[PDB]
Paper text:
Fluoroquinolones stabilise this complex which cellular processes convert into a lethal lesion, likely a frank double-stranded DNA break.
Moreover, a V18 structure solved at an unprecedented 2.0 Å resolution was obtained by improving the crystal quality through seeding with a graphene-PEG nucleant. Except for analysis of the drug chelated Mg2+ (which is better defined in the 2.4 Å E-site structure solved by combining multiple data sets), we focus largely on the 2.0 Å V-site structure, whose overall higher resolution meant that the electron densities of the bound drug, the base pairs of the DNA, the puckering of sugars of the DNA, and the side chains and main chain of the protein are generally much better defined as is the water structure. Moreover, we see >1000 individually imaged water molecules including those in the inner and outer co-ordination spheres of the two pairs of functionally distinct magnesium ions, and at a pair of K+ sites discovered here in ParC. In our topo IV-DNA structures, the Mg2+ chelated delafloxacin molecules are bound in a highly unusual conformation in which strikingly the 6-amino-3,5-difluoro-2-pyridinyl substituent at N-1 is tilted 51.2o out-of-plane of the aromatic bicyclic quinolone core. In this regard, the 2.0 Å delafloxacin complex is highly informative as all six positions in the coordination sphere of the active site Mg2+ ions are clearly resolved. The remaining three inner coordination positions are occupied by three water molecules, one of which links to the non-scissile phosphodiester group joining nucleotides at -2 and -1, with a second water potentially bridging to the more distant phosphotyrosyl formed by the catalytic ParC Y118.
Numbering used by the authors:
A (entry chain A), B (entry chain B): 411 to 648, 1001 to 1486
DNA sequence: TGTGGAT
DNA sequence: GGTTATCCACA
DNA sequence: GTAATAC
DNA sequence: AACCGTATTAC
């Protein structure tokens, strides 16, 4: 039931037959359609293959996908592996030419290396190579489709005696027709493979264990030593026919590519705006489409489709789940998306699918995007070079700390808990005035996290350690109170639970305590929560020891947990473990760049208008000459030329004069224009002084942070305690 | 496994407890969140409930949803039904306030009427009424939100505290938050219910059997007698508290609403453009978004999400599957969508989901939309009154016959097979010249269907009957050929199969014939089809009788089938069974309206431009005076007034003069404007003649249809034979 | 075991 | 529309 | 026992 | 991403 289904070849022939291991059932379908059914079999992989270096050998051998591979190859598994029983001469791995494709290659290669080594050794395991590019279009009798695998092969194809043709940049196998798949990647005559060889059993064994073994620290080290976070990779001169590569180099190049991508571009937040790329794209796309807080909700499926088609070439379930999370006020301290409909619950009940719900950006989310239209932040080409997207948002509140981040990458993970907006701003403002400020002083403004689920955080020293180093362990404990009853009876009443805990599962875990009588005293467990309030009632038997029961429950259920800070974020393209000081100084440095770039943008605009207004006032004095000149001129371009040469107007002034509508000649009021010149000069002065003076800039930064605080501040929800 | 999961009430209490039967798991989730958990239980319904009047009893008691309803109510079924054992005092049906909601009510009420009648009889079965409208005035005072169920309650709310207020039109329970659901529809204090009463067991029994029984003809008749296809329905008038209604009237109102909707707005094509609403929306939306044949493909999920958000308030799987079908050249003779990726196959393998594929309109589909921008076709408000959509497309080729339609409605179905485009145009052009043309003569141009799957159609007389009446039965038979082998030995080779037949299932069925040895002689069945062509090989045993085998197979497999024509389409809002004559004359009448409206649009545009050009020629002769005049004027309106009074320009001319940009005075070439005057006058004359003379209009209609034919004609694929 | 973006 | 897998780091 | 738009 | 239900008409 759980594995890809094998489409076998029509005829047995272990001399020639090929098993295609295909990334995904949909591309598996295309391969089924495009293949030569006589000798090529198709086994689709349902996403990420089990890591056979990490998992246990019972567990590996109860994995459906692995079993159906061992069945099909018909040769046992290593120890019992008879290459002379093998049903194929080639096992051909065919994935997307993308980073998750690279990962899948890695995982499969570790299975073959670890349990079918003769197969690898004999050079029977191959890879793929789909094209990255398709060029050209000239109708039916076509003369205008070729394919390319490198930028250099692409440059070659651009030279075609034609003009501009069409270029497709392939994102995956799922954009290719079965004809195209066969021609480019499955036909022995025309495909390009990589034969995987072992050049050195010792260097291979090392490289596979470091990349794919249980131990993080060597993999982290390998990544620090090998991955170039601030440089692109050069990428191979694509050789045709077959081309050998060592298991060593394939594993290193593939896992390097994947690692770098999921570190920088998936699971870890940017230190400045606090966003993962998917979250930033959600916000930018919704904002670009005017799906803001002040306008009506818009069908989720529409938002998600625009996000996917314009910015984020990944599954809609990934996009939609991230958008839903941004709407849930038990996950985010300051929700960034407002969602009508079933956006889930603290019981973890499934949110309605995107066909049902509708959404827009929250008001505070607009503050993440404030001044994105004023060239405040670096943009980059989207995935297919049709549109630009921000690499970071202006971020007028410090979202990294306010909403936190929880992610799992390669060689790194991150847990940054949420914080109270007012308190974070208070620390930031202090640090604007005192750049060398120390943790003890900062903690007067920012004493600890502020979970949206409230509860009690215990461990002042551990907060401090986390704020210093990025790592610490604190206790988070449910808010409880005792309530008397009839019968000489008490009940424990829970009104706030720990962050990230599922209420329904907690209730079940507590009820199992009672059922198994692990501790004595429990009469009944009732969830009495409703739409207005969380309320769990643990009703105790007559003369139960309520302290014994409550302490048992703190210890052995998630009624209390440990929260481990592991504060990692992307800073200068590279993952970095950070305390509060780097977090806040990065934010400040970011706001500095934003305010300066905004001020330049606005000043340029005001100067252009000023120069135009000066030109219009001058035009009055020479109106008859200007009209005559324009009438004499051959066209618009010529008229402007004559204005500059004859009368010393700038380009911008000349463009403005020649595009005036005739009816504007009714107005000869220079006084209103002079008033505007003066207003513009005042503004330019203020903007120039912000650019020319660090302290003027910093004082504007504080004024704006204080405004955000005043508008969005809410009371702290979690209480802080020192020890137990 | 297959049923909605019950969320029970906390405390048993048959006096007060309520079972909510909720349309869909997602709204079931919202109901779970919004309820009062003490007495309200939630049983979600997974879509359409089994029709307990139609289906067997084997099937009814094998149905998971029905069984879990019987279980939960706790009162046996039918014969053994004890109302004093019932676990709820109220069974409350809560659906979307939409047509499929109405259908679900209908199906449930038939179950309770037939197998829990005492429950209905005692007035314990109710229907929750969700609001249609929410009215709001944004952030502020308090947020300010009231609800409405009728247009009259809506009109009231417009006054109330409304003016600069936003109105949400609810499309489903899926757009409501759990607190909104409780306030409006689940709280006993504030909800409005309908108690379902039996006023008359005899009238009820009849009304349930006609609407829900397996006999179509009475239902068809009931629909003809009761449903008003060309009138709106009256508003309910919504009373407070509970309000009783007879099972008779409920069933009639609800099933009438459903019937009309799926007849007019779902399963049946419009006779003019040949489209179902979902298909027309796919085309209009993709065309509006510039997703045409000449431009880059676009991610399917983007198209689909725009279609859903702007036009088609239904599931993405419905939309995407319809788009995919429009792309499959074994379903459509002239594909309307071009789709890259896995768009399925003749084996029925699942198309890739919308996250993988990308799409655009085909070139010929552009001809369905030609001149949509020239006020050629009636538009109507979309589902939420934000955007207009066409009720029918201009349709520059007769798509109803060319691409056909297969559909299943209420009381009616449709099968219209595909046809060859050139042939259909030939018939249409003949009929333009010979309005009273008869079937025998039309069939010289249009001899029969042309399936995109080819094969052999047999039964000339039955084609003629179908072309006369809309109904007939023809044989469709696979194209076959014999091939010799070494061993002397023969094989039957199939290269074309019947329309709508799955190849893989046919192959399997033939192989079962071999295995069961129903006819002597079959050695092996092999599908040897590949990307370049269909080829199924039936290898016979030495000295098998080819003809005996082939005859067995035609008779007892789908290697040959009957195609039953049942040509139903919507004509003047009403379903109608139609032969070729009404189909073609409707088309012609449609193109007449289009060409006339286009000609009026273009003529009006030319006349406006002509008047402007006349004024611009006059301006040039008095340009100095005009510029001086404008300079003497106080403002735009004064300048125009001075132009009218001093020089007799019209309003339109004056507005055009005074909004000229100064650079436009570089071009005062009166001869070029005179040339333009002449060209415009010639065009107006041509356009006027089309409007003033039917034959001029019909000649243009034929010229255009012949151009389409010349561009898009392809040879016949199906062969026709006279005897079956 | 479970967190959250991915296949 | 629920259900069912995997990866990755870190308790 | 399957077709195609719906839940 | 496969797999699994139902309505509706008509063979
Ligand atoms: N849970 C619910 N599902 C459906 N529903 C919708 C489907 C779709 O939109 O494409 C679909 O393909 C589908 C397949 C099914 F097999 C199916 N049934 C299997 C049984 O468990 C349910 C159901 Cl019901 C299905 C619904 F429309 C509403 C629902 F709440
Ligand atoms: N067939 C394939 N599916 C996945 N895949 C994608 C999911 C998603 O996009 O949200 C998902 O939620 C999901 C759940 C699963 F339980 C699941 N497995 C159950 C086993 O049968 C497979 C798989 Cl694998 C899943 C894939 F990414 C690629 C696929 F080909
Ligand atoms: Cl101006
Ligand atoms: Cl003009
Ligand atoms: Mg991919
Ligand atoms: Mg998923
Ligand atoms: Mg604990
Ligand atoms: Mg609905
Ligand atoms: Mg479906
Ligand atoms: Mg037959």
């Amino acid at each position: 039931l759980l594995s890809g289904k094998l489409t076998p070849a029509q005829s047995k022939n272990p001399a020639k037959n090929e098993l295609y291991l295909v990334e995904g059932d949909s591309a598996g379908g295309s391969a089924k359609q495009g293949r030569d059914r006589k000798f090529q079999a198709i086994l689709p992989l349902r996403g990420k293959v089990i890591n056979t270096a990490k998992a246990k050998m019972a567990d590996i051998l109860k994995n459906e996908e692995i079993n159906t591979m061992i069945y099909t190859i018909g040769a046992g598994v290593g120890a019992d592996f008879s290459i002379e029983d093998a049903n194929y001469d080639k096992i051909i791995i065919m994935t997307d030419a993308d980073t998750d494709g690279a990962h899948i290659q890695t995982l499969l290669l570790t299975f073959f290396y670890r349990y079918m080594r003769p197969l690898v050794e004999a050079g029977h395991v191959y890879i793929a190579l789909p094209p990255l590019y398709k060029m050209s279009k000239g109708k039916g009798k076509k003369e205008e489709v070729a394919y390319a695998w490198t930028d250099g092969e692409l440059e070659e194809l651009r030279k075609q005696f034609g003009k501009g043709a069409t270029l497709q940049r392939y994102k995956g196998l799922g954009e290719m027709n079965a004809d195209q798949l066969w021609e480019t990647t499955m036909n022995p005559e025309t495909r390009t493979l990589i034969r995987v060889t072992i050049e050195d059993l010792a260097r291979a064994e090392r490289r596979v264990n470091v990349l794919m073994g249980d131990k993080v620290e060597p993999r982290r080290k390998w990544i620090e030593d090998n991955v170039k976070f601030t440089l692109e990779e050069a990428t191979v001169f694509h050789m045709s026919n077959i081309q050998n590569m060592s298991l060593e180099d394939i594993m290193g190049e593939r896992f390097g590519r994947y690692s770098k991508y999921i570190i920088q571009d998936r699971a870890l937040p940017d230190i400045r705006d606090g966003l993962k790329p998917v979250q930033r794209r959600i916000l930018y796309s919704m904002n670009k489409d005017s799906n803001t807080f002040d306008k009506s909700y818009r069908k989720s499926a529409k938002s998600v489709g625009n996000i996917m088609g314009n910015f984020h070439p990944h599954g809609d379930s990934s996009i939609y789940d991230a958008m839903v999370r941004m709407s849930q006020n038990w996950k985010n301290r300051e929700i960034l998306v407002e969602m009508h409909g079933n956006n889930g619950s603290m019981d973890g009940d499934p949110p309605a699918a995107m066909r049902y719900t509708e959404a827009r950006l929250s008001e505070i989310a607009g503050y993440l995007l404030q001044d994105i239209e004023k060239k405040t932040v670096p943009f980059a080409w989207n995935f297919d070079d049709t549109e630009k997207e921000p690499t970071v948002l202006p971020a007028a509140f410090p979202n990294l700390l306010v909403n936190g981040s929880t992610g799992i990458s390669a060689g790194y993970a991150t847990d940054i808990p949420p914080h109270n907006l007012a308190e974070v701003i208070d620390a930031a403002v202090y640090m604007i005035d005192h750049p060398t400020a120390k943790i003890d002083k900062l903690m007067e403004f920012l004493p600890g996290p502020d979970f949206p689920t409230g509860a009690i955080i215990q461990g002042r020293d551990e907060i401090k350690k986390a704020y210093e180093t990025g790592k610490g362990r604190v206790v988070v404990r449910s808010k409880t109170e005792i309530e008397k009853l009839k019968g000489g009876k008490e009940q424990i009443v829970i009104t706030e639970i720990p962050y990230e805990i599922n209420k329904a599962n907690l209730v079940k875990k507590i009820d199992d305590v009672r059922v198994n009588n692990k501790v004595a005293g429990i009469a009944e467990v009732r969830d009495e929560s409703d739409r207005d309030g969380l309320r769990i009632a643990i009703e105790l038997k007559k003369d139960a020891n309520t302290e014994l029961v409550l302490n048992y429950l703190f210890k052995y259920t998630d009624l209390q947990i440990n929260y481990n800070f592991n504060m990692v974020a992307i800073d200068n393209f590279t993952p970095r473990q950070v305390g509060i000081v780097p977090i806040l100084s990065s934010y400040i440095a970011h706001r500095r760049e934003v305010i300066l770039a905004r001020s330049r943008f606005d000043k340029e605009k005001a100067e252009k208008r000023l120069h135009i207004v000066e030109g219009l006032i001058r035009v009055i004095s020479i109106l008859d000459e200007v009209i005559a000149l324009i009438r004499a001129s051959e066209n618009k371009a010529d008229a402007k030329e004559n204005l500059k040469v004859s009368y010393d107007f700038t380009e911008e002034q000349a463009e403005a004069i020649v595009t005036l509508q005739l009816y504007r000649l009714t107005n000869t009021d220079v006084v209103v224009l002079q008033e505007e010149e003066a207003e513009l000069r005042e503004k330019i002065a203020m903007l120039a002084a912000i650019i020319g003076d660090e302290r003027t800039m910093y004082n504007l930064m504080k004024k704006e942070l204080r405004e955000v605080k005043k508008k969005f501040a809410t009371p702290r929800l979690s209480s802080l305690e020192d020890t137990a």
